[PDB]
Design an enzyme around this catalytic site. Sequence first.
Site, PDB file in Angstrom:
ATOM      1  N   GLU A  14       0.374  -1.267  -0.259  1.00 33.35           N
ATOM      2  CA  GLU A  14      -0.691  -0.283   0.261  1.00 33.35           C
ATOM      3  C   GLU A  14       0.184   1.186   0.306  1.00 33.35           C
ATOM      4  OE1 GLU A  14      -2.795  -0.332   3.327  1.00 33.35           O
ATOM      5  OE2 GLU A  14      -4.404  -1.499   2.287  1.00 33.35           O
ATOM      6  N   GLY A  15       0.302   2.567  -0.224  1.00 33.24           N
ATOM      7  CA  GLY A  15       0.981   3.899  -0.691  1.00 33.24           C
ATOM      8  C   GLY A  15      -0.057   4.941  -0.432  1.00 33.24           C
ATOM      9  N   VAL A  20      -1.408  -1.556  -3.955  1.00 34.53           N
ATOM     10  CA  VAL A  20      -1.635  -2.883  -5.470  1.00 34.53           C
ATOM     11  C   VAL A  20      -2.018  -4.101  -5.130  1.00 34.53           C
ATOM     12  CG1 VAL A  20       0.431  -3.958  -6.537  1.00 34.53           C
ATOM     13  CG2 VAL A  20       0.063  -1.180  -5.923  1.00 34.53           C
ATOM     14  N   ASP A 121      10.981   9.346  -5.528  1.00 33.58           N
ATOM     15  CA  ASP A 121      10.701   8.522  -4.666  1.00 33.58           C
ATOM     16  C   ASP A 121      11.715   7.559  -4.648  1.00 33.58           C
ATOM     17  OD1 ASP A 121      10.657   8.352  -1.756  1.00 33.58           O
ATOM     18  OD2 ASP A 121       8.134   7.884  -2.681  1.00 33.58           O
TER      19      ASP A 121
HETATM   20  O1  LIG Z   1       6.087  -0.136   0.140  1.00 31.57           O
HETATM   21  C1  LIG Z   1       5.003   0.718  -0.270  1.00 31.57           C
HETATM   22  C2  LIG Z   1       5.221   1.897   0.520  1.00 31.57           C
HETATM   23  O2  LIG Z   1       6.391   2.444  -0.274  1.00 31.57           O
HETATM   24  C3  LIG Z   1       6.196   2.365  -1.182  1.00 31.57           C
HETATM   25  C4  LIG Z   1       5.185   1.209  -1.122  1.00 31.57           C
HETATM   26  N1  LIG Z   1       5.284   0.230  -2.663  1.00 31.57           N
HETATM   27  C5  LIG Z   1       5.583   0.990  -4.094  1.00 31.57           C
HETATM   28  C6  LIG Z   1       5.622  -0.405  -4.934  1.00 31.57           C
HETATM   29  C7  LIG Z   1       4.227  -1.757  -5.263  1.00 31.57           C
HETATM   30  C8  LIG Z   1       4.335  -2.747  -6.364  1.00 31.57           C
HETATM   31  C9  LIG Z   1       3.494  -3.433  -5.556  1.00 31.57           C
HETATM   32  C10 LIG Z   1       4.127  -5.010  -6.802  1.00 31.57           C
HETATM   33  N2  LIG Z   1       5.070  -6.161  -6.464  1.00 31.57           N
HETATM   34  C11 LIG Z   1       5.433  -6.587  -6.738  1.00 31.57           C
HETATM   35  N3  LIG Z   1       5.520  -8.527  -6.645  1.00 31.57           N
HETATM   36  C12 LIG Z   1       5.473  -8.607  -4.985  1.00 31.57           C
HETATM   37  C13 LIG Z   1       5.179  -7.817  -3.998  1.00 31.57           C
HETATM   38  N4  LIG Z   1       5.803  -8.459  -2.938  1.00 31.57           N
HETATM   39  N5  LIG Z   1       5.737  -9.148  -3.683  1.00 31.57           N
HETATM   40  C14 LIG Z   1       5.398 -10.547  -3.054  1.00 31.57           C
HETATM   41  C15 LIG Z   1       6.579 -10.624  -1.574  1.00 31.57           C
HETATM   42  C16 LIG Z   1       6.419 -11.304  -2.830  1.00 31.57           C
HETATM   43  F1  LIG Z   1       7.375 -12.298  -3.960  1.00 31.57           F
HETATM   44  F2  LIG Z   1       6.056 -13.474  -2.176  1.00 31.57           F
HETATM   45  C17 LIG Z   1       5.222  -9.456  -4.740  1.00 31.57           C
HETATM   46 CL1  LIG Z   1       4.650 -11.172  -5.917  1.00 31.57          CL
HETATM   47  N6  LIG Z   1       5.114  -6.505  -8.557  1.00 31.57           N
HETATM   48  C18 LIG Z   1       4.345  -5.027  -8.984  1.00 31.57           C
HETATM   49  C19 LIG Z   1       4.084  -4.250  -8.282  1.00 31.57           C
HETATM   50  C20 LIG Z   1       4.151  -2.807  -8.967  1.00 31.57           C
HETATM   51  C21 LIG Z   1       3.813  -1.768  -8.054  1.00 31.57           C
HETATM   52 CL2  LIG Z   1       3.410  -0.056  -8.067  1.00 31.57          CL
HETATM   53  C22 LIG Z   1       3.743  -1.582  -3.873  1.00 31.57           C
HETATM   54  F3  LIG Z   1       2.452  -1.905  -3.610  1.00 31.57           F
HETATM   55  C23 LIG Z   1       3.982  -0.315  -2.868  1.00 31.57           C
END
Ligand SMILES: O[C@H]1COC[C@H]1N1CC[C@@H](c2cc3nc(Nc4cnn([C@@H]5CC5(F)F)c4Cl)ncc3cc2Cl)[C@H](F)C1
Length: 262
Positions: A14-15, A20, A121
């Site tokens: 979340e942001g 997401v 950022d």
């Molecule tokens: O962490 C917060 C606070 O500061 C930044 C903000 N962040 C920014 C990125 C955002 C994001 C999340 C994403 N996460 C993924 N994949 C992801 C993240 N965690 N995981 C799971 C941990 C795991 F790999 F099992 C995965 Cl898969 N793919 C695209 C994404 C696009 C976006 Cl825009 C994410 F939702 C929010």
Amino acid sequence: PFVEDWDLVQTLGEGAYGEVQLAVNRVTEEAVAVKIVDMPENIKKEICILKMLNHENVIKFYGHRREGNIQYLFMELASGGSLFDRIEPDIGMPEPDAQRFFHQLMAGVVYLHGIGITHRDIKPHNLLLDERDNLKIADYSLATVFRYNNRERLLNKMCGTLPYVAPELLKRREFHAEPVDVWSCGIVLTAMLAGELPWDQPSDSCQEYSDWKEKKTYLNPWKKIDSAPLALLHKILVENPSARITIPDIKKDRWYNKPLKK
Ligand SMILES: O[C@H]1COC[C@H]1N1CC[C@@H](c2cc3nc(Nc4cnn([C@@H]5CC5(F)F)c4Cl)ncc3cc2Cl)[C@H](F)C1
């Protein structure tokens, strides 16, 4: 929950505005990431910046769907999670992994800067990893155009994350966009090599910032970092944005070009 063909399975984070979610296509089984924004001019600007992005170290955009007051930003899924989760607290990570992630972060920032976009950022939370461990710069809600028609625009808006912001955001009414992104790439480098942030903000008050400016590298997190990457950090973390190293000259640095293995 679900959107048209995609099924919302797990929350990825979340942001400031939104959340997401990981979405799996019910028909083709293909998994993507969806930003779920609630409720005007910043969302129109974000979508515009997102369609311009096409680079292997920048999160790919697919499209958006509007369902009343809820938008859905379809982005590339980085199955490897974030770079934040790869930094062991107080340790960091092996130097060859930090160097590899740093080369890829520079590739993405050179790309963004070439199309006239500043991310504003950069931090390990915004740096995501794919299945093959490739860094992708994600979250363009603070991103802005600093160059249009080959004409540079100075910034004035305060934004980012305090431990990652450059000192000119605090002390100047107008500043160049590129050296701000370079500074945050240096704090990310520090985090990868020491698993710790040097200061809370690069301001006059901060004792940790004042100690860095006095070249007291006998203190943490600098004592955890080797002489080759610390010499690069000495060129990036410069208070004068006009005296700071540029990305073309980071590409010429000794540690940047040093062969590292394991
Ligand atoms: O962490 C917060 C606070 O500061 C930044 C903000 N962040 C920014 C990125 C955002 C994001 C999340 C994403 N996460 C993924 N994949 C992801 C993240 N965690 N995981 C799971 C941990 C795991 F790999 F099992 C995965 Cl898969 N793919 C695209 C994404 C696009 C976006 Cl825009 C994410 F939702 C929010």
